[PDB]
Design a binder for this molecule. Structure first.
Ligand SMILES: CN1CCc2nc(C(=O)Nc3ccccc3NC(=O)c3cc4cc(Cl)ccc4[nH]3)sc2C1
Ligand SMILES: [Ca+2]
Ligand SMILES: [Ca+2]
Lengths: 233, 52
């Protein structure tokens, strides 16, 4: 995250972190339930083997609340395309169940029609992660969050040098230097409704980070609700 | 605005229009309250709540 604020204690409890063999984070995920993590399909090609860390806010130090979970099943969308990052979504089933506690809790899945007319028509959603703090910099050792405006589909088509499919939506700022960035990929975009947070997006891609006249591109979760439901069995 | 377009039909969470009336429902882990509008968490750590 470029700009934004730290997640304070208990503020971003649905955040998960994919960690490589070297125990370093390379992508985010969202906790959907005790066995299932939502992430981006493209994240699956960035580590041969990986695990899931939950409950972490500061990767510099184990503060006792952290837990690691191995992945039993990977379920990647069959139509994912490296070319365009269309269908950039995967679900992970964990070998052992997550224990919910301070800083570890799932985000809600909404119903599709209500989500589209009610959540995605709100001003802003919230994105979070341990990604880069600047386009060229290193990954944050602290969990950050950022409020990002939903962006008009048309404005976003015009801003983009790559195709924006109907499986994507745009969020972020025109010029203001705030955005997700590399390493945030896979993580939650959630929309608050009356003090309840629903998952609305997966951090997918952007042309650099926080560039002027550019936006962040997110997988549109509402397009995949049935697929997710099926995948969770 | 009417029904669900009017302050979410007074529902806490999901609002649907069935016939010409509001029907509220809730995410998994919540139950609909007696008034048919509020969603009551059934356990600790319901989805979508920051942890206290
Ligand atoms: C169709 N494509 C798929 C992947 C892609 N990656 C691109 C690219 O330009 N990456 C990049 C190269 C160097 C440094 C940073 C980044 N950005 C990123 O990694 C990045 C991911 C991301 C997600 C959100 Cl929601 C908002 C901003 C973002 N920036 S352009 C592009 C187009
Ligand atoms: Ca830690
Ligand atoms: Ca921008």
């Amino acid at each position: 995250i470029v700009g934004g604020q730290e997640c304070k204690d208990g503020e971003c409890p649905w955040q998960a972190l994919l960690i490589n063999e070297e125990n370093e984070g390379f992508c985010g995920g969202t906790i959907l339930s005790e066995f299932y993590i939502l992430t981006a399909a493209h994240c699956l090609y960035q580590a041969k083997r990986f695990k899931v860390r939950v409950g972490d806010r500061n990767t510099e130090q184990e503060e006792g609340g952290e837990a690691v979970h191995e992945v039993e099943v990977v379920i990647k969308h069959n139509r994912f395309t490296k070319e365009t990052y269309d269908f950039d979504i995967a679900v992970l089933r964990l070998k052992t169940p997550i224990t919910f506690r301070m800083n570890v809790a799932p985000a809600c899945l909404p119903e599709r029609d209500w989500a589209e007319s009610t959540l995605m028509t709100q001003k802003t959603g919230i994105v979070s992660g341990f990604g880069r703090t600047h386009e060229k910099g290193r990954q944050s050792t602290r969990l950050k969050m950022l409020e990002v405006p939903y962006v008009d589909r048309n404005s976003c088509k015009l801003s983009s040098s790559f195709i924006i499919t109907q499986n994507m939506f745009c969020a972020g700022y025109d010029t203001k230097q705030e955005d997700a960035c590399q390493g945030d990929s896979g993580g939650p975009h959630v929309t608050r409704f009356k003090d309840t947070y629903f998952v609305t997006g997966i951090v997918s891609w952007g042309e650099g980070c926080a560039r002027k006249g550019k936006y962040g591109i997110y997988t549109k979760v509402t397009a995949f609700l049935k697929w997710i439901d099926r995948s969770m069995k | 605005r009417k029904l669900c377009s009017l302050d979410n039909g007074d529902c806490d969470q999901f609002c649907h229009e069935e016939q010409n009336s509001v029907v509220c429902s809730c995410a998994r882990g919540y139950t609909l309250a007696d008034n048919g509008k509020a969603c009551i968490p059934t356990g600790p750590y319901p989805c979508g709540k920051q942890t206290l």
